[PDB]
Amino acid sequence: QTVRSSFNNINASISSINAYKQAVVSAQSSLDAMEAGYSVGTRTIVDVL
Amino acid sequence: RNFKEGSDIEAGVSLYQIDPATYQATYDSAKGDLAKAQAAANIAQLTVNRYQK
């Protein structure tokens, strides 16, 4: 149960990374939608931050 | 009246200044509603320039 716990933790935690590695690519896209959206003016500086 | 009577008038010359006070009012109320068009069309222009970027 201990060995299969870690082996089924690391198989989760790879997919956990590829979840939250996409969640960066979401949020890095959403940030750059703000920095381009604030440099032209549609979104404000607090919707940036 | 804006002419010497009996003279020779050029084309496009004012003969009689007619009372403009109900046409100057409409000319302002078109030019007023012009600015109602081209202030909103300022912004819908500027939204697209904020969207093309």
Technique behind the model:
cryo-EM
Quote the CA–CA distance of B34 and B45 in Å, as a whole number: 16
B15 neighbors B2 (Cβ within 8 angstroms): yes
Identity (one letter) of the amino acid at A40?
V
Resolution of the determined structure in angstroms stands at 6.5
Most A CBs within 10 Å, among B46, B48, B50, B52, to test the A interface: B50
For residues A46 and A36, what is the distance between their CA atoms, to the nearest angstrom?
A: 14
Per CB-CB distance under 8 Å, the chain A contacts of B48 are none
A48 Cβ partners below 8 Å, 6+ apart?
A31, A34, A35, A37, A38
Q: Measured on CA atoms in the order A13, A17, A19, A23, is the torsion positive or negative?
A: positive
CB contact under 8 A, A41 and B50: yes
